[PDB]
Structure 1
Amino acid sequence: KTHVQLSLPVLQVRDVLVRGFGDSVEEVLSEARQHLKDGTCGLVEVEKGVLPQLEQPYVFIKRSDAAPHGHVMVELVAELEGIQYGRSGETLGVLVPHVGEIPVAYRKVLLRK
């Protein structure tokens, strides 16, 4: 399937134990996709002071279309020192590994895979 229905656990930034996916744009995008497939991917909603508490490169999920079954359609865009690799709509948040942190909510998305 080109798209996969996922419910992503929304984590508070100060709870997150592993604050990024790796060390290159290509690695974070690869790791993000692997974790999304394995259901070990969390989502941190971006606000003032959230991104400086996480590790670059960042992986964003961004709205790719204006929402089957409640699931917003999203795609991945990485960012490293202010350059984004990808072009998409509004940020739904930043992806991080999930290693058992208690979520505050769940974000139903349809991931272009």
Structure 2
Amino acid sequence: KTHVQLSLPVLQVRDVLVRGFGDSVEEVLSEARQHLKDGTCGLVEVEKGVLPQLEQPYVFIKRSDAAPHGHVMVELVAELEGIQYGRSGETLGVLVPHVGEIPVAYRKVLLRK
């Protein structure tokens, strides 16, 4: 399937134990996709002060369209030193590994895979 319905645990930035997916744009996009498939991916909602507490490169989920079955259609865009790899809509948040942190909410998305 080109799209997969996922429910992403929303984590508080200060709870996150592993603050990024790796060391290159290509690696963080790869790892993000692997964790999304394996159900081991969390989402941090971006506000003032959140991104400097996480590790670059960043992986964003961005709205790709204007929402089947409650699931917002999203795609992945990476960012490193102010350059984005991909072009998409509004940021729903920044993806991080999930290693058992308690979420505050779930974000239903339809991920372009």
- TM-score, normalised with respect to structure 2: 1.00
Give percent identity, aligned residues only: 100
Task: Deviation per CA, 1:62-106: give whole Å up to 9, x if none.
Answer: 000000000000000000000000000000000000000000000
Q: Which runs of 5+ in 2 are unaligned?
A: none
Secondary structure in structure 1 of the residue aligned to 2:52? helix
1:6 and 1:16 map into 2 onto residues whose CA distance is 20
Task: Deviation per CA, 1:41-69: give whole Å up to 9, x if none.
Answer: 00000000000000000000000000000
Aligned length: 113
Q: Which runs of 5+ in 1 are unaligned?
A: none
Task: Deviation per CA, 1:26-55: give whole Å up to 9, x if none.
Answer: 000000000000000000000000000000
> Which of structure 1's runs of 4+ aligned residues deviate more than 2 A?
none
2:41 is matched with 41
2:50 and 2:82 map into 1 onto residues whose CA distance is 15
2:112 and 2:103 map into 1 onto residues whose CA distance is 23
1:59 and 1:18 map into 2 onto residues whose CA distance is 13
1:63 and 1:45 map into 2 onto residues whose CA distance is 13
2:106 and 2:40 map into 1 onto residues whose CA distance is 13
Residue 48 of structure 2 corresponds to residue 53 of structure 1:
no
